[PDB]
Structure 1
Amino acid sequence: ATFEIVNRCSYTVWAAASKGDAALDAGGRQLNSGESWTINVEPGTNGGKIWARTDCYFDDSGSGICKTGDCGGLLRCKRFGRPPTTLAEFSLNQYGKDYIDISNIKGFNVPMNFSPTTRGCRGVRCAADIVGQCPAKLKAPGGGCNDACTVFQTSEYCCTTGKCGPTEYSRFFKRLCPDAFSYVLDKPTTVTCPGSSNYRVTFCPTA
């Protein structure tokens, strides 16, 4: 499958794509405002994620740091990024279907549209100003809005026992972005697409 990753933000983003134990394609790249990066993801990929990182500095060897979404200080991510990270999530070619979603379970840093470029299913979007509205206790100093599990580390926020309910913090994410997961047992906002669809992730889709 092919994914076009488009930075519509007015600021530079460092895109990342990983399946947790390995990079997808090159795994990461600088995207200036307006730049597009097309990657090839292998059919049958399970648990892929795409996200944006902000305020990064890297050297020549590709080591450095980002203020949101850092993946162990590498430009080319091999594993997942440090919250807060708005997450595009996908599993491809699972019994003839593709499954996509946007997730706020690891917080929010950049607004995002996640849409197919082929036919047969709708896209999902989380483009509200979650950072600006972020509750005081969840604001990440580096920018972005942390999830309650990252901040407080309780069984309720992290759904550690497999049972947990909505919280005042999860309801904040859900009210601004109903189409994204707000906690682990949120009623699924997953979209079912035909197998081997193609996709576009757009950062800052409206502004």
Structure 2
Amino acid sequence: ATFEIVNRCSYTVWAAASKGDAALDAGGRQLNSGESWTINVEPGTKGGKIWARTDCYFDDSGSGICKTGDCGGLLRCKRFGRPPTTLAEFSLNQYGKDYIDISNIKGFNVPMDFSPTTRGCRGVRCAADIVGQCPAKLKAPGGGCNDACTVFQTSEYCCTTGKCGPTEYSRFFKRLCPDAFSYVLDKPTTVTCPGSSNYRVTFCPTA
């Protein structure tokens, strides 16, 4: 699959793409306002994620730190990023179908649209001012709005036993972004696309 990742924010983001134990394509890159990065993701990739990182510093060897979404201090991410991170998630070519979603399960940092550029399905978006409205206990100094599992580490918020319900904190995310996952056992907002679709991930889509 081809993913075009576009930064429509007025600020620089450092995009990242990983499946948890390996980079996808180059794994990360700086995107100034308006810049686009096209990556190729191998067919059959399960559990891929794309996210933005904010307020990064990197030296000439690609080592440093970001205030949101840092993946162990690397420009080119091999692992997933530290919350809070709005997540574009996908599994490709699973029995002839692609599955995509946006997730707020690891919090929110940057607004995002995740849309197919090929026919046969619809896109999803979370573009509300979650950071501005974020409850005080979830607000991350670095920027962003953490999920309640990250902050409080309870079995209920983290759904440790595979049994959990919605919470005041999950309902906050869901009210502002109904098409994104707000907790582990949320009614799925997963979209099913034809296998081998192509996609566009746009940061700050209403900017």
For 1:71 and 1:157, the matched residues in 2 are separated by: 23
For 1:48 and 1:147, the matched residues in 2 are separated by: 20
Deviation readout 1:3-46 (Å, 9 max, x if unpaired): 00000000000000000000000000000000000000000000
For 2:145 and 2:5, the matched residues in 1 are separated by: 22
The Cα of 1:167 is off from its aligned counterpart by 0.2
Deviation readout 1:118-155 (Å, 9 max, x if unpaired): 00000000000000000000000000000000000000
The Cα of 1:90 is off from its aligned counterpart by 0.1
The Cα of 1:191 is off from its aligned counterpart by 0.2
CA-atom RMSD, angstroms? 0.2
TM-score (norm 2): 1.00
Count of aligned pairs: 207
For 1:153 and 1:206, the matched residues in 2 are separated by: 33
Tell me what 2:12 maps to: 12
Mind listing any 5+ residue stretches in structure 2 that lack a counterpart?
A: none
Counterpart secondary structure, 1:132: helix
For 1:162 and 1:69, the matched residues in 2 are separated by: 26
Counterpart secondary structure, 2:115: strand
For 1:68 and 1:31, the matched residues in 2 are separated by: 15
The Cα of 1:2 is off from its aligned counterpart by 0.3
For 1:133 and 1:98, the matched residues in 2 are separated by: 33
The Cα of 1:65 is off from its aligned counterpart by 0.1
Deviation readout 1:70-121 (Å, 9 max, x if unpaired): 0000000000000000000000000000000000000000000000000000
Tell me what 1:40 maps to: 40
Matches within 5 A, 1:115-126: 115-126=115-126
Deviation readout 1:177-206 (Å, 9 max, x if unpaired): 000000000000000000000000000000
**Aligned sequence identity (%):** 99
